[PDB]
Amino acid sequence: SGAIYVGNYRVVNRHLATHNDWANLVWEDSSRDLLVSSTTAQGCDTIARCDCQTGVYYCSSRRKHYPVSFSKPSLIFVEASEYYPARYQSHLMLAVGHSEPGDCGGILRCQHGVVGIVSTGGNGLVGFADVRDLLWLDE
Numbered sequence: 001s002g003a004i005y006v007g008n009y010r011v012v013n014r015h016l017a018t019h020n021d022w023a024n025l026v027w028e029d030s031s032r033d034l035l036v037s038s039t040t041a042q043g044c045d046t047i048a049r050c051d052c053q054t055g056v057y058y059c060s061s062r063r064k065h066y067p068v069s070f071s072k073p074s075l076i077f078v079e080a081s082e083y084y085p086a087r088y089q090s091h092l093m094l095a096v097g098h099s100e101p102g103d104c105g106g107i108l109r110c111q112h113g114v115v116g117i118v119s120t121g122g123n124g125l126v127g128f129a130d131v132r133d134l135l136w137l138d139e
């Protein structure tokens, strides 16, 4: 699990969104596994506005942060699950590293800020949903 808190916005994995997230829906994209909901309290996470291909992610299944090299956001084929049938997920970045389903929501960060959140895994590859192109999260 895990979310990004910025301004009056909360960003979560779309497959993990709650009834309160859907009741205060701002934007959601199934193709991206992303959902943004509105909040009463103000968030203070910083979003990165860059094209860094290195960073650090939080892995709840090991209680560890890991440095990773990751690909640029792209259309990557994602196997079927209880949440989605087999599809291409857009704005996806892959890295060689450990992940388990419950690690979805863990933040990926560079020197500039929050890059995205864990959203896929398997075969020793972890996939992160990019958020750097969502310029509106800051206004």
Ligand SMILES: COc1ncccc1CC(=O)N1CCC[C@H](C(N)=O)C1
Binding pocket: 015, 033, 078, 081, 083, 084, 089, 099, 100, 101, 102, 103, 104, 118, 119, 120, 121, 122
């Ligand atoms: C980080 O997740 C994993 N890591 C290792 C093994 C397995 C996983 C689970 C995983 O990839 N997904 C399940 C939940 C929805 C996902 C999606 N965006 O379509 C796919």
Ligand SMILES: [Zn+2]
Binding pocket: 048, 049, 050, 051, 052, 110, 111, 112, 113
């Ligand atoms: Zn950066």
